[PDB]
Amino acid sequence: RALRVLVNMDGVLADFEGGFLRKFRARFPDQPFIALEDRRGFWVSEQYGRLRPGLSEKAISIWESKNFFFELEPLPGAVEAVKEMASLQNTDVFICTSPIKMFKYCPYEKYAWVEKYFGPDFLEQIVLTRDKTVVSADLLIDDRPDITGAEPTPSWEHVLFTACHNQHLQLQPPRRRLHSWADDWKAILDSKRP
């Protein structure tokens, strides 16, 4: 009876693209880079690899480094919106996020980041998983276009959160976007209420 909304972390709450670019340029100042306006495709490393050999690996080294995830800036309006959303009657919010493959820092720092911006109690709302299709909900707000896994018919509707890497993408008609946290997320939630 409560509406259940999964909110993705990187690309939705936390500015992974901006953080990556800043730290990449700082560490590899003699290398070429991709301006955010020129990003295409979800995987940063794939575009960097196309741009010259060995650059994929240098890109990966940025997000595998300590404090990369912890130091990400929140996207504008994201913390306020999620706080408001969680406080709504008949509304349960989980943060549903995937770790990178190297697990030394990323799990820990994602929990740390949520504590920082949402408080200790909000840690109870974190679902860390590589497969979001096995998490049941009414809505998943996520910047990644292709959300696949072991469940062929997830219970949620995937609402595509706009990011630099996806802003030009034409989606299969029934599919919907949340263009930013200034956009009308309440109306999206309301369209799903019983």
Next chain:
Amino acid sequence: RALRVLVNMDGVLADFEGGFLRKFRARFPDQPFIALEDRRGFWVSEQYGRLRPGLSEKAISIWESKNFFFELEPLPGAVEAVKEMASLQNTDVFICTSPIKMFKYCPYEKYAWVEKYFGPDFLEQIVLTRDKTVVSADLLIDDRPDITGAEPTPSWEHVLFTACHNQHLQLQPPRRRLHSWADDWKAILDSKRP
């Protein structure tokens, strides 16, 4: 169409009770302890607290310490059974586990432990969550008696994995047990197949 089984970690794959007792006695040799045969109730700290003041906090300090989760021994038959289970046709296995509240080590070490016993590829199967009711599956094999959360009608059947803390518990009749990994887990899976 594939059967989906969530397998819990502590108390099912990893021997949290035995590990705790060993390290508690080593660190607090002048304190009284609870032999595994005398354990009752899921929460170790609650029973320790009843046994004398301040002992709850000393207990908690054991599992909050570095390497506690990483150094847990697998339960007999657990690694072999899960490997066999995951290899079965039409059978998807996820490891569904909750972190403790202090997140400095536990997330990381649980991933590390799964890598150690199941290999890098099995990391894709981990779901870290405080709420298992929002994870959809056919079966949840879990030593904790009370599995609650935001979903009042989970999709899985909870099969109670026997542990020292629950072995005397009378369950509400429809509820089922897996008494150990030597017990016939294949038959349990089969009862759920379409």
